[PDB]
């Protein structure tokens, strides 16, 4: 019974507990490069990717992600035709790039096949517990009738689901189990690791095969983005920190003269419900209209240029290989 | 001097201080097996017990909870008479599975063989000390005059304890030493031990024997739940979570048109009261109404089959056996 | 250069760090014996000490924690005449033990010698900074002179402080720097040792030479008391937790309708003055009125002897001896 | 794959980790000495210096910490002719010491040669990150010019920083990345050093070459002053102390009846525009109005008097290199 003693063995950090170390630069922050290849079709002029969730991306917000050189996920709840139009309406728009999320469910064949009709740029397999056979069996499946097509596969959280994704056929990992600003899975089902340790974790083992990770929830602040990539992810999703924007899909609501938007997970009650005997396992709630998302983004790269250049990373690819972490208490989050 | 020396060794974790580690799972939340068998004649469809506690069950909620697959403990702050007739009356819905609180003292035995004579299905022999010469010469005594009845004995935390209510003959163990939502103990007396290493610890004794664990106490979330059962307890036992419902004894109050329970300690001043020196170790007072039990249930066990469904756990004993935790810092539960 | 590579090897524990761990009884706590004996001429009922202090110990006070089998320590904001005065009032109330502090000076013999001629029966020597040879030298000139008295000097926080003070000749050692409620000396100086800490490493060195300690300062609750004492200590002292009530000195003042008594650390700017260019090192605040000390010692005790039933402990050398902890996390405070 | 190895195992300790261990002291807290000598033509009477920032240290300033026995920074957003006339009426108040800050920019060597031919005492030449190529091979320019002048270079955080910053010419290295009241670089870069351990690991580098660290930022109470010292700095560097006094620069603002003061960091909105495409990494806000500047100091001087009273600290050389901290958790704080 290994299994028994070694219950209770694992530590793991998330992004409050550590900071990252300054060391020689000769870079200024204006002169740092923030690009990043995910595949030989897929490369990112900065690393973020806006959530592929129903309050935070449709063809608005995909559209001034790519254009500020970044990326969106078309959410999986609508129809198939509404989705298919969706990504058409992206690549119309000038030669953007764009994904779109499915389910792993019967007709996700169907749905993809629609997709890529469309020319999609990637596909996003994701469910909320991607170490399933049924994740790894529809990966296979498509795969083998699209081999060229950018599969990013999750969530996951261990090298272990990592290791299998990857050799089932997905050439992007999307890393989170528990990190959401709206998630309630630690509550509910007690279950999650923090979001730097998966990060590292999943990273260490992806770059054994050359597969880029996402990190995927919890970045509630820029410096948070930058550990995240520092921690050996090549990207990062955020949901919170664009659901705010005008480019966002919903209704900007005015409440005692202050203008929000709704924001809600998509294992909410009201999402699950769009998406059609679960235990919802997300909130909804409101976030401050934040104006369009270019200031989001300008004030987001900034806080990553910053970053490097304490660390002196000229690039991204040297941010992930030689930035070091300092451990603190919970007392030195007050110092900050 | 040895033990001078080994004072500040030891090192616990609560429920708040770990999270489960996803796994590889093919079985869904759906699909998975919630059933626990605690003995051969006391089986379990989902892993509940209410509370032995005068504002959490009576018949009712026994009866409810045995409805659902679980267990309610008719408490003791009633005579046998009294508490006789609450067990007769479960027994009447058709066969339902109910257990019963005995105290430890000169009357206990007076007690159980009129539990026994109702037809119990098991007596919660338990004190706020389960490690004392008191409890164990009671259980020995129980389990010379029953052989076949099903004895839980606590609340104990340390596999010491929990090795010898063994031997005494308790064929079921509950764990818990301070975790409680209404508990003063260990702010009053300084005494408790955290409630995910006190399961684990009695667990890793009791499985030698092959004896189950209730896990009693410190639960406020579902997900608390599933990393007690992870943590080796068959089954957890639940006061907080329970007493605003419906079937709960106690009147519900409407303060400023909000629906409002009383949930107390047993070790409360006004339960001690009612139960008849000692400094209360108990608190009183109010949780939110919560209408029908079975609403609150469904949405535990739903948070239960969730997690199982992320650990791989096509059922309790996979659960119990091959979860593994996490640890984090403190800073680490604000995400 | 082994001081600056050891600068911050030390770990400390407080009181909320840890929990007194259950182990077997055979012993109810109604039958348990709270008892010690500090030495052969002062034998305590109860193992409580209330502090010398001008908001909390005069001859009242001291008369009725004699009675409750306890002491009381006179304090030393008055003259000689009124302080020889203030004992002697509390020995002729019947036969009641009585100590008194004595600041570190050089009218400190004159005082003494009032003290003793008024049949005191402990002088406590505490200043701020026990380890200092200013103490060492007051405690040989006193013990020279008094052979048999019973001397208390403090206070201390390290072991090696501990074996000046015994060599020096005091028969009781009291332990606390910076853990006192009324206490700014750690926000101030940046000066002190975690309470359990220190008590645990002033018994290892006191129990060598066969001295009890007592633990002063920051005992909030009566489970503070018991861990105190499980961490080797044979008696507390405690200031806030009496100040409340009936028997200490100072007028209850109302304010909106509720009774409050006012307790001053001795080192705050008021009670310095009494006393008579350091900088204040404790504050000026209210206490709830308690009522009589009868109630505040019946709880105190209660949650001790409830405290021994729980360790088996049939008397407090058991308890001193044997109990153990377990250490837990700052998440650890929110189960309790 | 050693850098990716590694990248987790560094732990830093902030103010609020640690206290001072006392120990055996003869030396009563007004008998103690706190001069400190950073170079042999740069004595201080007091070991502390007023930050260089446009809301606590001008000439009125400057000149009353110099009376105290400290120093002051003239700030830098302003011409080099408004600097160096504030920092010759400084030196006009009676040879008082004195020092200015210089950015890292092509005008730096025209603005230090008026500030030389003014007499100042010491150049702060100091950037968010010190450890730059930019930072270094402007010192060597600066000290090849000017052989015998004080050098201040900062800001860092590592032991490689400070040998880099030694070996370029520096004869004083600051130190402090990201622990300032004002600061949110650690929000908004993610990037920082827990400002002991910073203290410590530069400490345990310039030793070796008899350099001075000066602790900057952090500091809220006299304990983190005493806490500094004791883990290495020769002396302490303070703006949010400071920014409320009545000599430091700014209008005093009166809301609600109460007298405020503005406080910013030099990398705020309002700093960064007034010393002219970075996002900013410091707030503005405002500090309670504190009168004179001496009340301020004195409270400071007798902390750390009391602070090496306890530890038996003669003067500032046995703090640095005898005192011992005691580490504790968060609980701990608490008391
Ligand atoms: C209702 C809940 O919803 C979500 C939870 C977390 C993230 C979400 C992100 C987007 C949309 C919904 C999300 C959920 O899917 N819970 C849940 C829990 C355990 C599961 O285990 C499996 C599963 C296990 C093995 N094979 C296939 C699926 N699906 C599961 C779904
Ligand atoms: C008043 C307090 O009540 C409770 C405390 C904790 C949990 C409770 C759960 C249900 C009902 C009451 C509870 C108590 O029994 N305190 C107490 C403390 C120490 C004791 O030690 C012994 C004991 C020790 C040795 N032999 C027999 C009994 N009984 C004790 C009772
Ligand atoms: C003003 C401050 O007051 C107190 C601090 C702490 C506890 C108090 C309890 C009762 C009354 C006053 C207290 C103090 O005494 N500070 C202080 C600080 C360092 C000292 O160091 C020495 C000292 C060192 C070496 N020899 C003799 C005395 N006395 C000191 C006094
Ligand atoms: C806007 C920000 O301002 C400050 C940040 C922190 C402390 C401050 C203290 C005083 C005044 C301004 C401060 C900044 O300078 N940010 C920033 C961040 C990274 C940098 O990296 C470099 C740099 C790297 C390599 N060579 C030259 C410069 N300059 C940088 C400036
Ligand atoms: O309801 C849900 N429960 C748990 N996680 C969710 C839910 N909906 C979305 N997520 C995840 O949370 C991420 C957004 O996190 P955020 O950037 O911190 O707001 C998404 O990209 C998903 O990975
Ligand atoms: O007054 C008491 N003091 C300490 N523990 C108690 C008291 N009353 C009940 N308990 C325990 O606390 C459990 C319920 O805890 P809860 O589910 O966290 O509210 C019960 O099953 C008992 O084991
Ligand atoms: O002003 C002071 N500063 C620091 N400690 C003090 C001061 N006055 C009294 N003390 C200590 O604090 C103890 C009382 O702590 P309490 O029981 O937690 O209130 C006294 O017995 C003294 O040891
Ligand atoms: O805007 C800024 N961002 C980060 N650090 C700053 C900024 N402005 C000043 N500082 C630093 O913070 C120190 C003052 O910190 P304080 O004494 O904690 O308020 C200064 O001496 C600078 O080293």
Known sequence: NAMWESKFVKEGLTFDDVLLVPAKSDVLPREVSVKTVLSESLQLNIPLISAGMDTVTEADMAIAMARQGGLGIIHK???????????????????????????????????????????????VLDTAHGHSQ????????????????????????????TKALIEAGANVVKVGIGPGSICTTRVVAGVGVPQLTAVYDCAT???????????????????????????????????????????????????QGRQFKVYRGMGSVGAMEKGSKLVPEGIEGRVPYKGPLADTVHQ??????????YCGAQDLEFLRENAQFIRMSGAGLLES
Do not use: C
């Not at 996402?214 to 983005?225: F, L, P, R």
């Not at 990207?235 to 209704?251: D, K, Q, R």
């Not at 987001?300 to 250049?309: D, S, T």
């Open 77 to 123: 709840n609508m129809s198939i035709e509404q989705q298919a139009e969706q990504v058409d309406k992206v690549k119309r728009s000038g030669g953007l790039l764009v994904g779109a999320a499915v389910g792993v469910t019967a007709d996700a064949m169907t749905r993809i096949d629609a997709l890529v009709k469309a020319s999609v740029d990637a596909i």
């Open 134 to 161: 049924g994740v790894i069996d529809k990966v296979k499946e498509v795969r083998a009738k699209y081999p060229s097509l950018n599969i990013i596969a999750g969530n996951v959280a261990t090298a272990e689901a």
């Open 205 to 255: 083992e992806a770059r054994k095969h050359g597969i880029p990770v996402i990190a995927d929830g919890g970045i509630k602040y820029s410096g948070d983005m930058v550990k995240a990539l520092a921690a050996g992810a090549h990207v990062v999703m955020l949901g919170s920190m664009f659901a705010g924007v005008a480019e966002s899909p919903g209704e900007t609501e005015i409440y």
């Open 300 to 309: 987001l790269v900034g806080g990553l240029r910053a970053g490097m250049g």
